[PDB]
Design a protein around this ligand. Structure first.
Ligand SMILES: OCCc1ccc(O)cc1
Ligand SMILES: OCCc1ccc(O)cc1
Ligand SMILES: [Cu+2]
Ligand SMILES: [Cu+2]
Ligand SMILES: [Cu+2]
Ligand SMILES: [Cu+2]
Lengths: 286, 287
């Protein structure tokens, strides 16, 4: 109820400087890479083997996993500077723009810009520019630069809209059998983006392009966290009507996707993280 | 102090029963696969990125990583069954045998036997034979079948000997720079087995064959844990012999190899595990 997580657009210049700076410190120490690795790792962890589900995606644990991810990340930032929290990127209002790429989130003082065509869409503005920020590939090897290409795909030329959000927010069930990319009338599946894909979360990933467009590489872009903070906030909002909806499945689901199963690669359960307040942070507006 | 890890050969039959049982239960519950994945993951987390060194092998943290690994793994065994402990495969004794394949670790009632060349080295005997034990690959996908092929390589025709263990224990340094498979007079590197390799730990892996012989799949073979229990034990004897030495690097190593660096994929540090008795077990030879 203490750490206040803010809209990237309500941050002061000081808050921006200090968040970027903390992020770079984590990078330099070597801790930022644990997160790329963790996310890649859970990606190839099938629940169960022979299945389309993995620990972080395409199943119920998708949300509590990323919540857990983000908590650990914020707490690492904290160890550096106890003032800094995680901002969220409200992409749905950026959807209202003529050119969403002109959002202040992509200023050189913050995330930096879209990839440069002349340079194969490598990001060359901001602090996370090539030369300033090392990327890691799927094998855990240096890849040579952050890439971005806003709206380059045919499936994801635009961002989710406010109306897409209100629409997921109407779903009353958290998730439904079989607990996968096929689940219908599922808030989890709808938020994730598979119902008439790609929507919301998935659409945003696809819209950014670069590493962000590929599962094993997405957390090479620090805006991965900004995006997953908006996702986590929307889940918070859904849970603002009461309560956690027994987070299906409670039981009898695949191991690692039940209320009290450990979420690889950690020992943390979904229940462990169902209430964000208990975790120690709150969203602005709350 | 209280949990006693024992030589496999001194285990009663019912001790071998319950251990095998417990492992099959972890496997059925879906917890066993977490251990295979955890090891594959750490195997691909390089320190620093672009290096040989990874969270689990080829650097200083090799020993305490595999120590944290087995601890978490024992604690889970004890969740299912409190009297079950992680036993050790004293492979340097089997080395003194005319035929190490006659070792009782390989009997149908414990680990099961060698791979089947007609079956392409699939293991057809014991609790972990094909049709009774599913395997996953590098990618988390089913591979259908534990494989083994004892002593079949040119580089690892035999198991490491008693004298091999004795000569490493004589090493005075835990580790030395540059903290990689290029470290000399390093107890860590000798034990891991890169000096004139494969020797000691590496040699064993390669001797067994199959999944055990490849890094990102080895824990598919339950023997992985008996083998790493011996390694841990070897390391703990060294700790007991060299009371004025400690783990290195204390600082100056790459992130993840230093004494108080977190070991991917966990937060545990080498420090948290330097004392094995403080973790709650000892090896039978200490009593
Ligand atoms: O287009 C986005 C691809 C992608 C989606 C989800 C992830 O976690 C990572 C990458
Ligand atoms: O000789 C190979 C040594 C080795 C050690 C650990 C593994 O996990 C795999 C192989
Ligand atoms: Cu993801
Ligand atoms: Cu994502
Ligand atoms: Cu290993
Ligand atoms: Cu090993």
């Amino acid at each position: 109820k203490y750490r206040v997580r803010k809209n990237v657009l309500h941050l002061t210049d000081t808050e921006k400087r200090d968040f970027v700076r903390t992020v770079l410190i984590l990078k330099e120490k070597g801790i930022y890479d644990r997160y790329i690795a963790w996310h890649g790792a859970a990606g190839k962890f099938h629940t169960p083997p022979g299945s389309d589900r993995n620990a972080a995606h395409m199943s119920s644990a998708f949300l509590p996993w990323h919540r857990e991810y983000l908590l650990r990340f914020e707490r690492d930032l904290q160890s550096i500077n106890p003032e800094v929290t995680l901002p969220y990127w409200e992409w749905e209002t950026d959807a209202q723009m003529q050119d969403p790429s002109q959002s202040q989130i992509w200023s050189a003082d913050f995330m930096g810009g879209n990839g440069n065509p002349i340079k194969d869409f490598i990001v060359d503005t901001g602090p996370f520019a090539a030369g300033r920020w090392t990327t890691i590939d799927e094998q855990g090897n240096p890849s040579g630069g952050l890439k971005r290409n806003f709206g380059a795909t045919k499936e994801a030329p635009t961002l989710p809209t406010r109306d897409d959000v209100l629409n997921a927010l109407k779903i009353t069930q958290y998730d439904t059998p079989p607990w996968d990319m096929t689940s219908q009338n599922s808030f989890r599946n709808q938020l994730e983006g598979f119902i008439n894909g790609p929507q919301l979360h998935n659409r945003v990933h696809r819209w950014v392009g670069g590493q962000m467009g590929v599962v094993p590489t997405a957390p090479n872009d620090p805006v991965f966290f900004l995006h997953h903070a908006n996702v986590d906030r929307i889940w918070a909002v859904w849970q603002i009507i009461h309560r956690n909806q027994n987070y299906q499945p409670m039981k009898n689901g695949p191991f690692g996707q039940n209320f009290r199963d450990p979420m690889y690669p950690w020992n943390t359960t979904p229940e462990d993280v169902m209430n964000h307040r208990k975790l120690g942070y709150v969203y602005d507006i709350e």
